[PDB]
Amino acid sequence: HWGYGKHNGPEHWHKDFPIAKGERQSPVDIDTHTAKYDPSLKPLSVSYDQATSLRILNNGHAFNVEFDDSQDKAVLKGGPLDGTYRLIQFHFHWGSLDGQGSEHTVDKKKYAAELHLVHWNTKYGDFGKAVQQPDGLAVLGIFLKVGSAKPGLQKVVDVLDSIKTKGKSADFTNFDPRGLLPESLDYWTYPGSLTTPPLLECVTWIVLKEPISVSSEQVLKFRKLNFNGEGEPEELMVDNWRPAQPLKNRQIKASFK
Ligand SMILES: CCC(=O)Nc1nnc(S(N)(=O)=O)s1
Ligand SMILES: [Zn+2]
Numbered sequence: 001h002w003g004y005g006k007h008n009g010p011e012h013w014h015k016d017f018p019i020a021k022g023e024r025q026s027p028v029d030i031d032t033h034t035a036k037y038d039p040s041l042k043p044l045s046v047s048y049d050q051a052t053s054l055r056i057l058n059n060g061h062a063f064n065v066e067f068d069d070s071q072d073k074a075v076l077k078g079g080p081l082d083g084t085y086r087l088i089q090f091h092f093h094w095g096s097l098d099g100q101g102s103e104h105t106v107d108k109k110k111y112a113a114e115l116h117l118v119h120w121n122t123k124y125g126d127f128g129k130a131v132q133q134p135d136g137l138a139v140l141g142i143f144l145k146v147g148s149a150k151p152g153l154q155k156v157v158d159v160l161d162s163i164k165t166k167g168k169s170a171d172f173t174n175f176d177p178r179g180l181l182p183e184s185l186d187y188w189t190y191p192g193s194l195t196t197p198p199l200l201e202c203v204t205w206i207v208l209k210e211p212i213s214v215s216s217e218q219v220l221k222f223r224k225l226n227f228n229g230e231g232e233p234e235e236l237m238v239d240n241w242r243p244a245q246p247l248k249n250r251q252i253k254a255s256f257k
Helices: 151-163 216-222
Strands: 044-047 053-058 063-067 075-078 085-094 113-121 137-146 169-171 187-192 203-208 212-214
Touching: 053 151, 063 151, 075 113, 085 137, 085 216, 137 216, 151 169, 151 216
Parallel strands: 137 203, 137 212
Antiparallel strands: 044 075, 053 063, 053 169, 063 085, 075 085, 085 113, 113 137, 187 203
């Protein structure tokens, strides 16, 4: 089964998921000098006030904070998007060291981690149908650098001990994802894919320019999670990031001058 190891990592995924070599794969390097400002791009509308988190899950590749997506409670609109995209979950990708961990890179710079807030286009009814459509998902990507702690992340950090191993979940209600955003909503946007198998080419990527700061202690706690299940030899959940893929026939657009 696929993962991030020597023998099942990103360079192997194409054998089971041939779209791994497709025309709109993610992540990509964001060449900031080649991205074109698009004055027609609109401000992102992030409406998370009524978000309903439910549960946090170690799935053996990351941890997901899941939300009730049965109503328009936490929605992303505007920007490059047409219509309404409902938040279903967020998760992160991180490194074994502070110098790597992000999936997208910025002028080849790797951040310590990257947060993905995953939304599906409500015109397709459910996430499973949305992933079959070129405009099915909108993923909001937020870079993490190591410095001052992010107070809004701490509630996530402190539950990780209870979901150390693959398959473990914990009740995780009343989490406000607004506490994970940076001050600015300036962004780059491009058409891409899921960055994990099945790598479906269904994502409008919206990657925020301003990283959030998290503390070394916060990210160290990410690195104490396990890829393995309970009762298996410990494999630290680190370096669960896919590297940058060829941009091919795509333009990255910037919301800001
Ligand atoms: C609801 C299920 C889900 O969100 N699956 C995803 N698989 N890869 C994602 S990524 N790293 O592109 O945001 S999201
Ligand atoms: Zn992700």
